[PDB]
Amino acid sequence: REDITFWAKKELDQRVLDKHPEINDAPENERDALIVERIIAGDYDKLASLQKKAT
Amino acid sequence: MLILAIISLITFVSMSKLSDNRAIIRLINIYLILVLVLDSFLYLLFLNNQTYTVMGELLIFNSFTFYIDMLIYFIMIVISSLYGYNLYNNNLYKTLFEPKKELIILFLINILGALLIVHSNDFITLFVAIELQSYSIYLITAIYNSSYKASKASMLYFFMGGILSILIAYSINTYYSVLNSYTLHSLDSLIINTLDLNLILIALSLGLLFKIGIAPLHKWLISIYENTPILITIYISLIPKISILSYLVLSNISINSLVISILAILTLLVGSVGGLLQIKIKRLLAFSGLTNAGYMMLLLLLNNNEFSYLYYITQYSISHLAIFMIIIFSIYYINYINNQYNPIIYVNQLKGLIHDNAYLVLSMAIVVFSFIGIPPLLGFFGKLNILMSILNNGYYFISIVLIVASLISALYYLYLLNVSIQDKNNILINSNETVSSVLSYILSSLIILITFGFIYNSLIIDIFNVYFN
Amino acid sequence: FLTSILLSSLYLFNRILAWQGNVKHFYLFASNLLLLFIVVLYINFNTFSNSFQFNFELFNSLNPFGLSNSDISNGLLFGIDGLSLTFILLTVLLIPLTLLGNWYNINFNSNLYYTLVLAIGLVILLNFWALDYISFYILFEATLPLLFILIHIYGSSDSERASFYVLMFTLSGSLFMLLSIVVISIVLNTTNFINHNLFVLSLDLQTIIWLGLFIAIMVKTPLFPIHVWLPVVHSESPLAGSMILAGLILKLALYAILRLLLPLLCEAQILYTPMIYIISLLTIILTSLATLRQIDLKVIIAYSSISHMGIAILGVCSNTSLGIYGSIVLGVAHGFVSPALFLIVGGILYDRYHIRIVNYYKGLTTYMPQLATYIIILSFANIGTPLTGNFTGEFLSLQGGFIRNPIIGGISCISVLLAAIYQLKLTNKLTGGISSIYMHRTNDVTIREKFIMNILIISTLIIGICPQIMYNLLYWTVNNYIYII
Amino acid sequence: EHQRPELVSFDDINYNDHKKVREAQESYTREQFIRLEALKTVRKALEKCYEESGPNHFEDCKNLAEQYLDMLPTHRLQGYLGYQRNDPSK
Amino acid sequence: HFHPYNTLGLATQSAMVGLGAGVVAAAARNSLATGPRNILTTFSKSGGVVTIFTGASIAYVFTYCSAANLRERKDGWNHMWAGAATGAVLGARTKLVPAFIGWTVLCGAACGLFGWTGARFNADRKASLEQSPKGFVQEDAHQTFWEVVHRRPLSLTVEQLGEGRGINAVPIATATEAP
Amino acid sequence: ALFTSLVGASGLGFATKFLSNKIRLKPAGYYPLGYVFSGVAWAGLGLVLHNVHQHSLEVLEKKK
Amino acid sequence: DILNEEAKIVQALNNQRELTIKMHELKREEKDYAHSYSPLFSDPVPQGGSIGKAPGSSR
């Protein structure tokens, strides 16, 4: 149960709920697909944030 | 305090009868123990590699040489225990392991001459001590004179030691003819560049080294070690090795020498492949000493080699001592005793040793795997710390020749094991008399050192760091 | 407290030796206690941390006998990640099975044999705990004298030559390993499984260092130039020696190539993976081909183990997360299924007839139907027939080897065929035909043999139906060794 | 509890401290896993498109298919070693 | 760089030293023997020793200097080729083809392992770790042999390894970023 | 720790007494007072080695 | 709780690495005549041979 894939899907959901909280007040199964369209619309990594010496 | 013992001892031994010889040796045994215990606090003199010169730049006392004299005393305590204690109370072992009247005299005079080499600063101290220990090995070889092989061996050792002593004398006076000096303290880092001391110092090192048994001139010493009786040869194999090598490691006069590297490669080669098809146990056992003296000729090329040296010295000394004591113990179980002086000769005579006293084979296996260099045991860290100095200093072909030589030498070490763990038809069940408590405790101490001595490696490196740096 | 536990335990041992002649009950008991202890450690293991969780130092100068709480550390370190603990779980569930495997056949001097077998198991247990290069290396060759004594005293006709080869080839590769370890310890002045990815060596110093470690790995996961001690040390060992060897030593060198080479020889490793692919394809094909003409029966399973380790090495050297994971699954599943095959040939077949030649054995189904059931189930489990863990390892390692080089992946994919030819050629000879006129009928397979077999078959089937059950240990270490800039 | 540890880089830190190096290691690793579940989200969305579309999946999700096949060479586990052993712009 | 070898005169010098070594070893075998031996049994009952010495000397130094002049660089491969020629000469006294091939390849491998470690019995002084810069660089410089850094330049990684497998001049992350 | 050093060196003394008993083809607990004799002797060697390492560390820290 | 206990061990191992590099520096360092040779009589000047000695023999 304790692995990086369940935790990483929960973290990616938490990050798009961080940036766009208006998805909060959609009803329950609309929330699923609104999260998915935000994941397709944006990176949400911060990997280029880590490689500052590269940039 | 050796001088006291010699002066006391020949006075006391001239008045004893021959019934008392063994007890005299017991006395000297305990005497040397209380020179270790009650007098070793002198290590406090040698803090931070403080070095003294004594008798007017004649002797040099540092902590290296203090460790060497402690090692020589410990080994003399073991050997004198082997003479002064009975194995069994049979009428057999009394006619086999019997000390002469003047044996302990020559032992202490040889320990004196061996200490005055490692503690030596000038060349005439070196000379006088070399001849003191050489005449003592002549007489220790010849003292069991009711034996054809020991008489022939003492004559051979006389002539081959005489040549290689005249070569040392020629090198010393040749050094004197170009420098009005006797010290290698004269050299001091600049003279070696502007003066060709190569041929002199290398001829000195060579004349010192051919007495150890380095490779072009090794066979005469293997014959002396096979011809001497089994108690004499455990002493004359060890003491000139550690005394002359502890001189030549402390004095760094053959650093990066091409001749010493040639003879070290040749020594590792001819000792490893020399003792392969051999069926006598002291022969087999002496080519081991040839290879393990090669591993020291390697450190002669080195600058600052005092850790690898001293570790591998006490390694080889404990392992050497134990493997001769184990085959002293196996004489009770052989089906055939020849040759009163040398009762076990052929290595197939220990064939069923696992079925009679299996823990003697546990002993044997431990010390043989430490000879090979197996990592839980003490011989591995000796070979490891030699490699750490060989590779640090650019000897890359020497390293691979060391590795191939150790792999080839593992064959005839394991041949002892291969013989002793085998089936035998008539095995022991019940034997009435016992081996010496005092003397089997020594073999067990020597094993527990070899197996559980890797524990104290970091303690030993820290104490090293303070007293030599 | 902890000393009083031990001299209670030493007194426990002395009393049960005084009242019972054998040791084997206490050795089984200590083995299963060691099992329960390692699984309690797995309960308390943090999978969310990349770091090393259960650390301890031995033989420090401030405390030579015992643990170390110090500002300065020069002893031997020990500790685990998920990669270590995978092989520790595989090791600890095999140690009671090898003590159980010789429960009745060793008659003469039993206590020596069981002490040697448990000692080898404990040394290999501590191999996966180690955290220095010298701490890995000391335990890495503590096995060899115990193996020499075990193979020499117990075995078939030819156990002298097999004991010599298991000391000789292993010592000869592992000395060059010591050369590279000495060079690492004099450049870095640290030997450590923690810091050692932070240090960067020069490229031509790395390519010198990498050779000596790879030569020892070529000897111990036996790749084609020296793959050669392995059939004779198998074919002439006793049963627990064969089982411990082919279940644990080969996977130990598979662990060493991850633990010792991939962190501080990255820039060397990229230059050398075509040479590793030459050697690993060439030890898959040529060994899988040389099994087809074999007269002896344990030698076939030895050559099988060569071909499977050759599949696993191009998984670790693939620079892919899939290849690393598949090599770990292959090592664990092979360590399950291959000692069961060595039990089939050495326990159920050599205890009954005391010969190992293939020409005596024919038609074993009609007197031994469930042995034959075992033989065909294990044959298919060894091939790469899926839902077994062997196919998961072989498939993911072949996929990683296809990513790193597609042409050597294409010619390495034929190992699926080559591994099945000799295995089914042996299996239909053993099961099929009229019963042998040489073999007189003996007992069918007993309860302890069926017990060992059932455990070693369920533990392949669970990994084969769901390989995810041990991803929680490995998801760090599958990303740890990748060098894709 | 869904705890979120802080993000550390390899470039601000001293490598002689081990706390920060181990955290930068785990940070870069977990960020690759976040990247990965973004790729998996688009894959499940694409197979939902294909299953809902039937015959016209060529033109309903041309862009989802192009997005999946463009993300696939670049969204995987890459390893911290290659960035921590080497510095670009040096 | 390098300068071409005197294959002519080094081979003449080698034939001289091999002739002398054969003279000395034949005299040594004469003196260390049994039986009726006189002054001119030194070259009849020698056992073919001068042939060994001179043939090995001519073969090794001819093949070494020729291979170093044909390859126009000096490394241990020339010692490999010259040791192969010496093993050919030492294996022709064995009048047997497989043993001849074994002498060739194994002596060439031993001499190539010799010449790769430096072709020196003894040490090199400045190449040693004792007499070289070691440890960390203390600030950023061209990392020498025997030295350790924390980070390597990526341009050195691209030039030394390549631009292929997983290895690139810019990381995969910042090559794919939104603006 | 000093106590762990003492107990471990006494264990080395017990090991050498046991092994010397078993070379003599005796039982293990043949003479049970030699165990405490050997353990006290090897524990005294451990005492000496511990004190020398302690003085050595103090000399090393006095170079501050 | 585990990152700190690994940083403690890494600090303890880097301390040993610094100590080892130091103790290697310390041996190759040159040393005084009063420490290398005997402490008492610290000058290398011989002034030897004192019976029939000539004035002007010193330099």
Ligand SMILES: CCCCCCCCCCC(CCCCCCCCCC)(CO[C@H]1O[C@@H](CO)[C@H](O[C@@H]2O[C@@H](CO)[C@H](O)[C@@H](O)[C@@H]2O)[C@@H](O)[C@@H]1O)CO[C@H]1O[C@@H](CO)[C@H](O[C@@H]2O[C@@H](CO)[C@H](O)[C@@H](O)[C@@H]2O)[C@@H](O)[C@H]1O
């Ligand atoms: C079973 C496995 C066998 C494995 C054997 C591998 C042995 C291979 C040896 C490699 C090695 C020792 C390294 C060994 C370290 C540990 C080894 C572990 C134990 C090994 C036992 C010996 O390097 C040798 O290589 C030979 C050819 O390869 C050469 O042969 C000869 O060629 C012609 C001469 O001019 C003759 O004309 C011909 O007559 C000879 O033939 C030798 O001269 C050379 O010394 C390399 O060391 C050396 O590398 C060089 C270049 O980086 C380093 O350069 C310095 O540093 C950089 C800035 O400072 C600069 O970049 C660089 O420019 C600078 O100069 C040196 O610091 C030095 O350290």
Ligand SMILES: CCCCC/C=C/C/C=C/CCCCCCCC(=O)O[C@H](COC(=O)CCCCCCCCCCCCCCC)COP(=O)(O)OCC[N+](C)(C)C
């Ligand atoms: C009351 C005590 C009376 C004095 C006893 C002395 C006996 C001399 C015995 C010699 C052979 C037996 C091995 C003993 C090794 C001792 C190590 C040591 O301490 O040697 C030092 C390091 O050695 C080095 O570099 C390298 C030495 C390498 C040692 C390698 C063998 C390791 C395993 C055996 C030693 C540990 C055994 C401890 C068992 C409790 C150098 O000299 P030290 O001035 O500091 O000596 C001081 C010892 N004192 C205080 C007892 C006098």
